[PDB]
From a paper:
Here, we showcase the example of ADGRG4, an orphan aGPCR that possesses a PTX-like domain at its very N-terminal tip, followed by an extremely long stalk containing serine-threonine repeats. Using X-ray crystallography and biophysical methods, we determined the structure of this unusual PTX-like domain and provide experimental evidence for a homodimer equilibrium of this domain which is Ca2+-independent and driven by intermolecular contacts that differ vastly from the known soluble PTXs. However, only three domains are predicted by homology within this huge ECR—the PTX-like domain, the hormone receptor binding motif (HRM), and the GPCR autoproteolysis-inducing (GAIN) domain. Our data alongside of theoretical considerations lead to the hypothesis that ADGRG4 acts as an in vivo sensor for shear forces in enterochromaffin and Paneth cells of the small intestine.
The crystallographic data revealed a β-sandwich fold. Six and seven antiparallel β-strands assemble the two β-sheets A and B, respectively. The A face is covered by another loop of residues 189 to 205 with a short helical stretch. This loop coordinates a metal ion via the side chain carboxy group of the residue D202. Two disulfide bridges stabilize the protein fold. C58-C123 links strands β3 and β8 in the β-sheet of the A face. C200-C228 connects the long A face loop 189-205 with the C-terminal residues of the PTX-like domain. The unit cell of the G4-PTX crystals on the other hand contained only a single protein chain in the asymmetric unit. However, there is only one interface generated by point symmetry that exhibits a sufficient surface area for homodimerization. Two protomers interact such that the two strands at the edge of the sandwiched β-sheet interact with those of the other molecule (β7 with β10′ and β10 with β7′).
Author numbering:
A (entry chain A), B (entry chain A): 26 to 162, 176 to 231
Write the structure that this text describes.
């Protein structure tokens, strides 16, 4: 299924997920962005996207890459390590969160719209290949939109220019939906007839 | 020299530093806190405290532990890795910043007063022993006060209770001053006649 012009209303929907049909190749550098909106003020732990490999099916404890959080925190997973920062994100407003991984330098950065909020150093490492990307997956407390993944480092000034990822693009017919109906919203940030 | 009842006015003083006379032992877990106040609104890169070992005298690029920042960021150094977070700290107000290192779990946390702002995961590792602790060292753009280091993990609720570190304590006669005159200020948070 293509998600062009559509968002994913995950709020309250515990047995729902969306997954990318294509496995993802080995990436030394990449940028991954998603748009999200929280539809409740005080939430529990949540996941927006996760990249799951065989590492995870052992005890369900190790995620190669993911964006998660709680009511006061954003949480990044990298190769089983976690990095958590305090956030004050408003509910009922769309936010764009982008992650940059420079596997050559071993640098992981998190942005809110054009502004960097976290830079972490870890082992230089590529992205482990052939995992599966999951969205929303208890369920994300709101809506998700416009996931993109590029095999290179985007500059801040490009994050909001409504580009399509060259590895994963929302608009492509690459998505598997489980018990969720994507919905059209012509007010969405990058919507174009 | 003892720093009891005194602060260190480093603002604008480029060739000044304070160092701890005692070398620090190997620590598997520790808490380190300092009070700081910025005396200019828009600042450049600064360091509040650093723990320097022989790793650093090679090209002056690797710091085993340090707290640094710029006008919009707080920066933690651990064994040469950096972790940077966006901050919005007000000038002309005292802030208490505490770091917790759990070398058993490989967990490094940063707090502003009682509130956690960063949790990072890294290699489980102890603190490298016998380095030298430096304060202020171009110079820190304001004043520093009440550095403490304990060989155990303090809970949030204790950070502001004006305890003395059991490894390093501000009030002990353990400090070497270079070209700075510590100043008494009876309004300081933990001052007691
Ligand atoms: Mg396009
Ligand atoms: Mg005392």
């Amino acid at each position: 299924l293509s998600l062009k012009g559509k968002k994913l209303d995950f709020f309250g929907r515990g047995d729902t997920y969306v997954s990318l049909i294509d496995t993802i190749p080995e990436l030394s550098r990449f940028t991954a962005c998603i748009d999200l909106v929280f539809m409740d003020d005080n939430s529990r732990y949540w996941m927006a996207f996760s990249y799951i490999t065989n590492n995870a099916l052992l005890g369900r404890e190790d995620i190669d890459l993911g964006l998660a959080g709680d009511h006061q925190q954003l949480i990044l997973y990298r190769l089983g390590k976690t990095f958590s920062i305090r956030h004050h994100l408003a509910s009922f407003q769309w936010h764009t969160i982008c992650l940059i991984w420079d596997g050559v330098k071993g640098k992981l950065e998190l942005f809110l719209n054009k502004e960097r909020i976290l830079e972490v150093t870890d082992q230089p490492h590529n992205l482990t290949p052939h995992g599966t990307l999951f969205l929303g997956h208890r369920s994300f407390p709101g809506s998700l939109y416009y996931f993109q993944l590029w095999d290179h480092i985007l500059e801040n000034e490009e994050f909001m220019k409504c580009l399509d990822g060259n590895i994963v693009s929302w608009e492509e017919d690459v998505w598997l939906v489980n018990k969720i109906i994507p919905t059209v919203d012509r007010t969405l940030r990058c919507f174009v007839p």
